[PDB]
Amino acid sequence: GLTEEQRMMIRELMDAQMKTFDTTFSHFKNFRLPGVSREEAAKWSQVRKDLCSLKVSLQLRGEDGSVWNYKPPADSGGKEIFSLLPHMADMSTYMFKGIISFAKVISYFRDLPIEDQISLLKGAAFELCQLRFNTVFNAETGTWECGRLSYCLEDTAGGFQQLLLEPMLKFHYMLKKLQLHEEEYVLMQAISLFSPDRPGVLQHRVVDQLQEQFAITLKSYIECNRPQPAHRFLFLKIMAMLTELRSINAQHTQRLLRIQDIHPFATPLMQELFGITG
């Protein structure tokens, strides 16, 4: 079994998750919706590539049972490729506030210096957000079911291998296929949050030690709850996915900055989290 301490660690994590993860997104409202030179050209060309394969349609199911569906525009002149960014900015900001609250209730996080808490959140915001999004991702329909809101991937010619190209999309399918428990997701969030190698951390020693504790807890949880040889390397697969997610985070953050540079749209909280002066 798990040590008493490990049991307490998981309980605190689950408590935090339940208190700060609005899984039905019932409190997400008041958000925006799409309405109804050489160097510069080079910037735009890269920006178009940064989001041409991350397109989603949006669906809103009203209380009365009506349904609004929004299909994004095809990559044309320019501007139209940013039609959903304001909305996305609102959804992610909503998620980030939930992630900040999550960290705040964790005793291990509170004891850290305020400057370190800030550094850890900046480094892991995107990661924790995507880990939570994975729990509401329906791999059968390629849709993130967020309460009344739904974001569906626009399938193309290729299809599976087509999407598998985008690292973050492949990540969601792969992670979903592991069929993790709430406990494993929350431990993944903790390992990501307490990354000692985030740029700006001062208490490297303490953070590294905390991460290891969380990792050993996850490894142990798996050993105790799934002895089946089929899960022999589950822990290592998870740790490998977290390392990948970290690379994906850096890459999307760069994407954000590139877009921001030619089409500012980040909310105030996003500017702080991803280092945008604005």
Binding site: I100, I114, E115, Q117, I118
Partner: peptide, 15 residues
């Protein structure tokens, strides 16, 4: 300087 450059985050973490 870090807190100075992240007032929102700082505020959210102290409540």
């Amino acid at each position: 300087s870090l807190t100075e450059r992240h007032k929102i985050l700082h505020r959210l973490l102290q409540e």
